[PDB]
Design an enzyme around this catalytic site. Sequence first.
Site, PDB file in Angstrom:
ATOM      1  N   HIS A   1       0.797  -1.241   0.000  1.00  0.00           N
ATOM      2  CA  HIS A   1       0.000   0.000   0.000  1.00  0.00           C
ATOM      3  C   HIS A   1       0.827   1.288   0.000  1.00  0.00           C
ATOM      4  O   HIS A   1       0.283   2.358  -0.271  1.00  0.00           O
ATOM      5  CB  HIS A   1      -1.027   0.028   1.145  1.00  0.00           C
ATOM      6  CG  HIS A   1      -0.487  -0.401   2.472  1.00  0.00           C
ATOM      7  ND1 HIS A   1       0.115   0.471   3.353  1.00  0.00           N
ATOM      8  CD2 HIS A   1      -0.492  -1.610   3.083  1.00  0.00           C
ATOM      9  CE1 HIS A   1       0.481  -0.186   4.438  1.00  0.00           C
ATOM     10  NE2 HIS A   1       0.119  -1.449   4.304  1.00  0.00           N
TER      11      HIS A   1
ATOM     12  N   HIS B   1       4.467  11.101   5.717  1.00  0.00           N
ATOM     13  CA  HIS B   1       4.087  10.807   7.094  1.00  0.00           C
ATOM     14  C   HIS B   1       5.261  10.216   7.841  1.00  0.00           C
ATOM     15  O   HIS B   1       5.715   9.120   7.507  1.00  0.00           O
ATOM     16  CB  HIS B   1       2.928   9.817   7.118  1.00  0.00           C
ATOM     17  CG  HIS B   1       1.649  10.420   6.659  1.00  0.00           C
ATOM     18  ND1 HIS B   1       0.563   9.683   6.243  1.00  0.00           N
ATOM     19  CD2 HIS B   1       1.296  11.720   6.529  1.00  0.00           C
ATOM     20  CE1 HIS B   1      -0.408  10.503   5.891  1.00  0.00           C
ATOM     21  NE2 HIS B   1       0.009  11.745   6.059  1.00  0.00           N
TER      22      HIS B   1
ATOM     23  N   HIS C   1       2.018   9.090   0.661  1.00  0.00           N
ATOM     24  CA  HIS C   1       0.821   8.838  -0.144  1.00  0.00           C
ATOM     25  C   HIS C   1       0.922   9.766  -1.340  1.00  0.00           C
ATOM     26  O   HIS C   1       1.369  10.904  -1.197  1.00  0.00           O
ATOM     27  CB  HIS C   1      -0.459   9.126   0.650  1.00  0.00           C
ATOM     28  CG  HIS C   1      -0.522   8.408   1.961  1.00  0.00           C
ATOM     29  ND1 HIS C   1      -1.221   7.233   2.133  1.00  0.00           N
ATOM     30  CD2 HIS C   1       0.061   8.673   3.156  1.00  0.00           C
ATOM     31  CE1 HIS C   1      -1.074   6.813   3.378  1.00  0.00           C
ATOM     32  NE2 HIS C   1      -0.302   7.667   4.019  1.00  0.00           N
TER      33      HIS C   1
ATOM     34  N   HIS D   1       6.651   7.109   5.399  1.00  0.00           N
ATOM     35  CA  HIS D   1       6.128   6.680   4.114  1.00  0.00           C
ATOM     36  C   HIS D   1       5.410   7.868   3.488  1.00  0.00           C
ATOM     37  O   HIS D   1       5.256   8.920   4.115  1.00  0.00           O
ATOM     38  CB  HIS D   1       5.160   5.520   4.304  1.00  0.00           C
ATOM     39  CG  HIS D   1       3.976   5.890   5.126  1.00  0.00           C
ATOM     40  ND1 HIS D   1       3.966   5.801   6.500  1.00  0.00           N
ATOM     41  CD2 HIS D   1       2.787   6.433   4.778  1.00  0.00           C
ATOM     42  CE1 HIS D   1       2.812   6.255   6.959  1.00  0.00           C
ATOM     43  NE2 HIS D   1       2.087   6.657   5.935  1.00  0.00           N
TER      44      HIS D   1
ATOM     45  N   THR E   1      -4.653   6.600   8.850  1.00  0.00           N
ATOM     46  CA  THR E   1      -5.413   6.813   7.616  1.00  0.00           C
ATOM     47  C   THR E   1      -5.538   5.541   6.781  1.00  0.00           C
ATOM     48  O   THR E   1      -6.121   5.583   5.700  1.00  0.00           O
ATOM     49  CB  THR E   1      -4.794   7.902   6.739  1.00  0.00           C
ATOM     50  OG1 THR E   1      -3.542   7.433   6.237  1.00  0.00           O
ATOM     51  CG2 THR E   1      -4.618   9.206   7.508  1.00  0.00           C
ATOM     52  N   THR E   2      -4.997   4.424   7.269  1.00  0.00           N
ATOM     53  CA  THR E   2      -5.239   3.117   6.660  1.00  0.00           C
ATOM     54  C   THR E   2      -5.769   2.191   7.735  1.00  0.00           C
ATOM     55  O   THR E   2      -5.534   2.416   8.923  1.00  0.00           O
ATOM     56  CB  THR E   2      -3.968   2.480   6.074  1.00  0.00           C
ATOM     57  OG1 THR E   2      -3.036   2.205   7.122  1.00  0.00           O
ATOM     58  CG2 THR E   2      -3.322   3.378   5.066  1.00  0.00           C
TER      59      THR E   2
ATOM     60  N   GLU F   1      -3.419  13.375   1.539  1.00  0.00           N
ATOM     61  CA  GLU F   1      -4.522  12.893   2.354  1.00  0.00           C
ATOM     62  C   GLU F   1      -5.198  14.082   3.025  1.00  0.00           C
ATOM     63  O   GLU F   1      -6.380  14.351   2.793  1.00  0.00           O
ATOM     64  CB  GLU F   1      -4.002  11.866   3.355  1.00  0.00           C
ATOM     65  CG  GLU F   1      -3.437  10.649   2.650  1.00  0.00           C
ATOM     66  CD  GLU F   1      -3.544   9.393   3.473  1.00  0.00           C
ATOM     67  OE1 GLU F   1      -3.014   9.388   4.598  1.00  0.00           O
ATOM     68  OE2 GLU F   1      -4.166   8.421   2.991  1.00  0.00           O
TER      69      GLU F   1
HETATM   70  N1  A6N Z   1      -0.956   6.792   7.190  1.00  0.00           N
HETATM   71  S1  A6N Z   1      -0.667   6.903   8.760  1.00  0.00           S
HETATM   72  O1  A6N Z   1       0.532   7.663   8.938  1.00  0.00           O
HETATM   73  O2  A6N Z   1      -1.868   7.354   9.402  1.00  0.00           O
HETATM   74  C1  A6N Z   1      -0.338   5.277   9.371  1.00  0.00           C
HETATM   75  C2  A6N Z   1       0.675   5.080  10.298  1.00  0.00           C
HETATM   76  C3  A6N Z   1       0.853   3.826  10.858  1.00  0.00           C
HETATM   77  C4  A6N Z   1       0.025   2.779  10.487  1.00  0.00           C
HETATM   78  O3  A6N Z   1       0.214   1.583  11.130  1.00  0.00           O
HETATM   79  C5  A6N Z   1      -0.620   0.470  10.802  1.00  0.00           C
HETATM   80  C6  A6N Z   1      -0.513  -0.542  11.885  1.00  0.00           C
HETATM   81  C7  A6N Z   1       0.391  -1.548  12.053  1.00  0.00           C
HETATM   82  N2  A6N Z   1       0.046  -2.145  13.213  1.00  0.00           N
HETATM   83  C8  A6N Z   1       0.677  -3.231  13.889  1.00  0.00           C
HETATM   84  C9  A6N Z   1       0.645  -3.295  15.276  1.00  0.00           C
HETATM   85  C10 A6N Z   1       1.300  -4.326  15.927  1.00  0.00           C
HETATM   86  C11 A6N Z   1       1.983  -5.288  15.203  1.00  0.00           C
HETATM   87  C12 A6N Z   1       2.008  -5.223  13.822  1.00  0.00           C
HETATM   88  C13 A6N Z   1       1.356  -4.198  13.158  1.00  0.00           C
HETATM   89  N3  A6N Z   1      -1.043  -1.541  13.748  1.00  0.00           N
HETATM   90  N4  A6N Z   1      -1.377  -0.565  12.936  1.00  0.00           N
HETATM   91  C14 A6N Z   1      -0.962   2.973   9.534  1.00  0.00           C
HETATM   92  C15 A6N Z   1      -1.151   4.226   8.982  1.00  0.00           C
HETATM   93 ZN    ZN Z   2       0.306   7.656   5.984  1.00  0.00          ZN
END
Ligand code: A6N
Ligand code: ZN
EC number: 4.2.1.1
Length: 258
Positions: free
Chosen positions: A62, A117, A94, A92, A196-197, A104
Amino acid sequence: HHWGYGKHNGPEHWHKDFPIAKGERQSPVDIDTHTAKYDPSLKPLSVSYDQATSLRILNNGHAFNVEFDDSQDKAVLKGGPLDGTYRLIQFHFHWGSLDGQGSEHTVDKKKYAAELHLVHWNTKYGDFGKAVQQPDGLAVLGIFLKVGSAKPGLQKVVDVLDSIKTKGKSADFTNFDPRGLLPESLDYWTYPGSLTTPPLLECVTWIVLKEPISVSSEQVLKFRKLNFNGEGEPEELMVDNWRPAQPLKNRQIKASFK
Ligand SMILES: NS(O)(O)c1ccc(OCc2cn(-c3ccccc3)nn2)cc1
Ligand SMILES: [Zn+2]
């Protein structure tokens, strides 16, 4: 049939697997610059990246993540709206299929070509997985990208992308300095929001810088050569991996600047 950014699995479908998608503090949002209020109590951001240790870059299907050693307080974000210390874990982007979309967050409905981000977790919770379960678990520093002059500090990222073209590919990516991705000014807007994901957890203090960075058309074109798909699968270009603005609901966006 997993979530993504296609017609059949994109942002408007996410709520079926992740009902928090329709929650009270979802991100991103439109930043209405005239309604955002200067908050004189907000402190300057403290971005301390001198000791950052990048390790690896990963195409996760993604976006691509540049990952850091977050087992010690190396690269940390403090101050501004934040209480305590937040450790950089990854950054990362977008981005869009065209220069007129990709961000975003939006600013008075303006979409930028991309958005960076820098993701940090609150060290009072011990690890990232615990932090995302807390309303003040993460701080994400968002930086807009516009297309113009090249960003010299981005080129090392751009040039490794051909080695992680497809989902699940990673490459060593040591000694990358994220200070080279910052703009001059640290003026910002801030509000409480979410990832946001998926899983769209409502654990983020958003800090969105007002000053965009400029990247070249050639740089963003190389982002757009990445693939959502895995190796040997039908090619689907990794473009338009952004969630649109979500309802602000009972939130105020605060500005660090007059
Ligand atoms: N786009 S954003 O910057 O908002 C953004 C920032 C971080 C993100 O993490 C997803 C995630 C991974 N895990 C995870 C937790 C424990 C173990 C493994 C994976 N939980 N959420 C998603 C979007
Ligand atoms: Zn992001």
